Amino acid sequence: LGTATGFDFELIDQAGLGHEKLTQARNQLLAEAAKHPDMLTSVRPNGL
Amino acid sequence: EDTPQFKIDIDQEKAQALGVSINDINTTLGAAWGGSYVNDFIDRGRVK
Numbered sequence: 658l659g660t661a662t663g664f665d666f667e668l669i670d671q672a673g674l675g676h677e678k679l680t681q682a683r684n685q686l687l688a689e690a691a692k693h694p695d696m697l698t699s700v701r702p703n704g705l
Numbered sequence: 706e707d708t709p710q711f712k713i714d715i716d717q718e719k720a721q722a723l724g725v726s727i728n729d730i731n732t733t734l735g736a737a738w739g740g741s742y743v744n745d746f747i748d749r750g751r752v753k
Contacts, residue, residue, distance in 0.1 A: 673749035
């Protein structure tokens with residue numbers, strides 16, 4: 658069942674936005690996540 | 706109930722005499738009057 662610590666989140670393109678727009682939104686969320694190290698740790702993409 | 710339909714007979718001899726292939730005849734007839742699914746494309750991120 659692989660790693661059981663952590664959360665496993667999926668960010669989703671719901672409106673045919675496309676790859677670039679989805680990456681930008683990912684960065685937006687990762688950047689906002691990094692501003693809360695008191696709540697969130699190691700928030701990272703599981704991708705290339 | 707049964708309905709009128711339009712019976713078209715391809716004349717094989719005349720086609721051969723004119724050098725027109727039956728495949729071209731049938732594709733032309735079917736593609737024009739019936740429509741033909743050629744292949745897929747990508748509309749706002751979704752294959753169609």
